[PDB]
Amino acid sequence: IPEWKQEEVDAIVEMIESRNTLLERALDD
Amino acid sequence: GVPPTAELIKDEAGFETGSGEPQEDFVADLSVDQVKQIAEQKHPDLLSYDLTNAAKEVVGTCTSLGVTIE
RNA sequence: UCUCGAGCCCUAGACAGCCGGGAGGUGAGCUUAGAAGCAGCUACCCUCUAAGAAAAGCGUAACAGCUUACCGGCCGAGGUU
Numbered sequence: 001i002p003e004w005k006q007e008e009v010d011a012i013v014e015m016i017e018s019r020n021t022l023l024e025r026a027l028d029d
Numbered sequence: 030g031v032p033p034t035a036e037l038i039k040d041e042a043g044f045e046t047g048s049g050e051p052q053e054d055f056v057a058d059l060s061v062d063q064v065k066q067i068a069e070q071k072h073p074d075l076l077s078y079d080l081t082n083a084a085k086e087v088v089g090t091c092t093s094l095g096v097t098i099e
Numbered sequence: 100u101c102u103c104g105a106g107c108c109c110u111a112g113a114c115a116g117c118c119g120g121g122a123g124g125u126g127a128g129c130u131u132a133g134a135a136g137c138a139g140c141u142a143c144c145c146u147c148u149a150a151g152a153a154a155a156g157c158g159u160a161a162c163a164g165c166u167u168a169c170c171g172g173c174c175g176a177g178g179u180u
Binding site for chain 2: 122123124125126127128129130140141142143144145146147148153
């Protein structure tokens, strides 16, 4: 459960509002 | 196109050489506005979008030569 | 080759391999006829960014060139000390 991975999932979700695995994770959110 | 940074500095500095050991031996100086001008002349050479960051790159070669800022 | 223990990494995709990326300011300054990642000395800073050293190793008279770090993909199960 690396922290940098969690910070990325957030950063992605942040741009979605305004790694492929991390993109999908964010989309699901 | 536009000449390199190392040179553009030595012009508005008045000095020709840098320093044998940077940040320990302050040779030249630079005001903020003077750096704003240099930030304009290298827009094509630099990757930064804002003039804010454009400055930071130029400001990133100075102190490593003994170029204090005020 | 067999057996037992400890730590760490892993389906938020690990270890390896293959593909792609390895960018700019800038060939950093100094020194030097020249030195541009890589003779030496000092520093080792910021941009774009998913990465990318003021360069870990070969290579050049010096560039080039070949890759290392670092990032991304393919793959898919354990891997590593």
